[PDB]
């Protein structure tokens, strides 16, 4: 998946950025820095509970 | 109904009450495809 692979791979901001860039490179460039920071926050919230 | 099927066409629980009695029975289980459908999806054999 475009983003499902990111979540699968994760289960740090730098590592999250690396995974997000490698799995979905093109779409990120269009997105603004603040919006991708918010997306990283969302992914953090998801990754809080892995069960 | 619709032709190609009832459509409530309601705006944003109450629907469930009508659904249970009028149309079909209660569910032992439920499944949801949260992810939406992209304009182009790769339909490889494994999927």
């Amino acid at each position: 998946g475009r983003i499902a692979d990111v979540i699968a791979s994760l289960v740090a901001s730098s590592c999250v950025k690396e995974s997000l860039l490698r799995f979905l490179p093109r779409t990120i460039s269009r997105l603004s820095e603040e919006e991708t920071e918010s997306w990283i926050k969302w992914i953090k919230e998801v990754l809080e509970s892995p069960h | 109904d619709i032709q190609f099927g009832k459509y409530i066409r309601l705006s944003c629980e109450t629907l469930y009450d009508l659904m249970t009695q009028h149309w079909h029975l209660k569910t032992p289980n439920l499944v949801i495809s949260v992810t939406g459908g992209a304009k182009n999806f790769a339909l490889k054999p494994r999927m």
Binding site: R2, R26 | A38, K39, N40, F41, A42, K44
Partner: protein, 57 residues
């Protein structure tokens, strides 16, 4: 095809045609899997072109 970046799958028809004449079945299967209506792609004009010229005498 994996990235799903910039194509609506409508222009692919052109490339598709070439495969059919260049005997590249794997690319045919790949195009079909990633979204292609062979019924819509197949038309009177396409079939006429395929039979008139590409068909061995």
């Amino acid at each position: 095809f994996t990235n799903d970046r910039n194509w609506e799958s409508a222009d692919l028809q052109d490339v598709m045609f070439t495969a059919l004449v260049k005997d590249r079945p794997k690319f045919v299967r790949l195009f079909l899997e990633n979204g292609l209506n062979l019924r819509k792609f197949l038309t009177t004009e396409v079939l006429r072109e395929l039979y008139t010229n590409n068909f061995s005498s």
